[PDB]
């Protein structure tokens, strides 16, 4: 596997969004604008990023703009270890075929950067009601259509074939209200896919934040880590008040939230986990917390691998 100091721990770029400081789309911005965003990430200690598809859209750039991007990525001291598609489901009713095609494009781009994972999930656009809430997860939004599960499996396998040929893997991001929205459902889904270049991304912070019953993360992670090839890793406080029935959660650094990631990262290692990490953190100071989380993971790994 990697050693602690070379294990990729990527900054997820979704917090930058896709608007340029001048008001247009980031896809059209001069490379120097991209460079200043990347610089903020390097300043906080990262070696790796995950550009997502919610920042500079690599699948959409011309080949010459890809090379402009490649130059500033290197100049700013960074590399891409994974590419995570966000709210771009391959079974979106309107855009699923486009999203599938973009996923294939990202599988071809990934090896050129040295990236080893393309990640997809079944989350879709936030609904208007979700956008009004203090956090989007406070109300249910998109719920996967049961009639499209077989299509989802077919398209996952198609992507996995391409990934395998390119020497990389596809990862499937666990997310609420989707085909892979509970530990048992995720396990059954990855077993049904039956593809040696596809694995889970156990982004269980997505579940721990929810105001609904949830098994303890120790139990959930033990189920899904054996099938995991990539890891969006974030934490939340979690609380409940039996007398009222109120739940609460707050995004927090890995060290401070409800999951014990010292125990869980060590468990992952024990279970043979070898995939890259990706620090995500919706809300709060997303980038600043991700940077603390990277340092945290590096200490945990250093101790566990010594």
- Which residues line the annotated binding site for Mg(2+)? 173, 203, 232
Cα-trace Rg, the chain: 18
Of the candidates 294, 282, 215, 288, the residue with the CA atom closest to the CA atom of residue 251: 282
Pairing of strands 246-252, 79-80: unpaired
x-or-dash pattern for Mg ion, window 94-133, by CB under 5 A?
Answer: ----------------------------------------
Residue of 34, 249, 278, 293 that binds a copy of itself (CB under 8 A): 249
Q: Is residue 144 close enough to count as binding Mg ion by CB under 5 A?
A: no
Q: Which does 203 bind (CB under 5 to 8 A by kind): a copy of itself, Mg ion, none?
A: Mg ion
Q: Which does 232 bind (CB under 5 to 8 A by kind): a copy of itself, Mg ion, none?
A: Mg ion
Of the candidates 7, 11, 6, 65, the residue with the CA atom closest to the CA atom of residue 37: 11
Q: CB nearer to Mg ion: give 66 or 250.
A: 250
Residue of 221, 286, 294, 297 that binds a copy of itself (CB under 8 A): 286
x-or-dash pattern for Mg ion, window 217-236, by CB under 5 A?
Answer: ---------------x----
Question: If you count them, how many residues does the chain have?
Answer: 306
Within 266-295, the residues that bind Mg ion by CB under 5 A are 280
- Considering Cα of 29, then 97, then 15, then 283, what sign does the dihedral take? positive
Q: Which does 256 bind (CB under 5 to 8 A by kind): Mg ion, a copy of itself, none?
A: a copy of itself
Instruction: Spell out the residues 6+ positions from residue 165 whose beta carbon is closer than 8 angstroms to its own.
Output: none
Of the candidates 13, 145, 134, 23, the residue with the CA atom closest to the CA atom of residue 78: 13
State how far the alpha carbon of 93 is from the alpha carbons of 99, 140, 186, 275, 294, in Å: 11, 18, 22, 31, 36
Instruction: Spell out the residues 6+ positions from residue 132 whose beta carbon is closer than 8 angstroms to its own.
Output: none
Tokens for 112, please give them: 């050129």
Residue of 78, 220, 292, 293 that binds a copy of itself (CB under 8 A): 292
Helix axes 149-165, 183-193, angle to 10 degrees: 60
Q: Which does 287 bind (CB under 5 to 8 A by kind): a copy of itself, Mg ion, none?
A: a copy of itself
Least Å distance, CB 212 to Mg ion, is: 18
Report yes or no: 208 and 218 within 8 Å, Cβ to Cβ.
no
Number of residues that bind a copy of itself (CB under 8 A): 44
Q: Is residue 203 close enough to count as binding Mg ion by CB under 5 A?
A: yes
Within 182-221, the residues that bind a copy of itself by CB under 8 A are 211
Q: What is the dihedral of CA 88, 91, 97, 101, to 10 degrees?
A: 50
Give the SS3 label for residue 217: helix
Tokens for 172, please give them: 């499937």
Q: Is residue 250 close enough to count as binding a copy of itself by CB under 8 A?
A: yes
Residue of 139, 187, 271, 298 that binds a copy of itself (CB under 8 A): 139
Least Å distance, CB 111 to Mg ion, is: 22
Where along the sequence are the contacts to a copy of itself (CB under 8 A)? 39-40, 43, 133-135, 138-139, 211, 237-250, 252-262, 283-289, 292, 296, 303
Where along the sequence are the contacts to Mg ion (CB under 5 A)? 203, 232, 280
């Amino acid at each position: 596997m990697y050693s602690a100091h070379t294990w990729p721990i990527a900054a997820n770029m979704l917090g930058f969004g896709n608007r340029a400081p001048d008001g247009g789309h980031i896809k059209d911005a001069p490379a120097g604008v991209w460079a200043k965003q990347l610089r903020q990430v390097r300043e906080l200690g990262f070696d790796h990023i995950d550009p997502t598809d919610a920042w500079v859209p690599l699948a959409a750039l011309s080949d010459s703009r890809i090379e402009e991007f490649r130059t500033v990525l290197a100049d700013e001291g960074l590399a891409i270890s994974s590419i995570s598609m966000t709210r771009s489901s391959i079974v979106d009713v309107e855009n699923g075929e486009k999203n599938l095609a973009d996923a294939h494009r990202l599988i071809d781009l990934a090896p050129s950067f040295g990236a080893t994972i393309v990640n997809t999930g079944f989350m879709q656009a936030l609904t208007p009601e979700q956008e009004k809430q203090i956090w989007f997860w406070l109300v249910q939004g998109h719920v996967d259509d049961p009639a499209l599960r077989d299509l989802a499996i077919e398209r996952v396998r198609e992507l996995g074939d391409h990934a395998r040929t390119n020497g990389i893997q596809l990862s499937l991001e666990m997310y609420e209200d989707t085909y892979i929205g509970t530990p048992d459902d995720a396990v059954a889904f990855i077993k049904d896919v039956d593809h040696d270049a596809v694995g889970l991304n156990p982004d269980l912070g997505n579940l721990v934040r929810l105001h609904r019953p949830m098994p303890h993360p120790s139990e959930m992670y033990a189920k899904v880590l054996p099938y995991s090839n990539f890891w969006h890793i974030k934490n939340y406080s979690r609380d409940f008040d039996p007398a009222t029935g109120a739940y609460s959660s707050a995004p927090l650094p890995l060290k401070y939230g409800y999951v014990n990631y010292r125990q869980i990262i060590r468990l992952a290692l024990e279970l043979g986990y070898t995939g890259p990490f990706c620090c995500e953190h919706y809300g709060s100071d997303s980038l600043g917390v991700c940077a603390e989380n990277r340092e945290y993971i590096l200490q945990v790994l250093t101790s566990a691998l010594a």
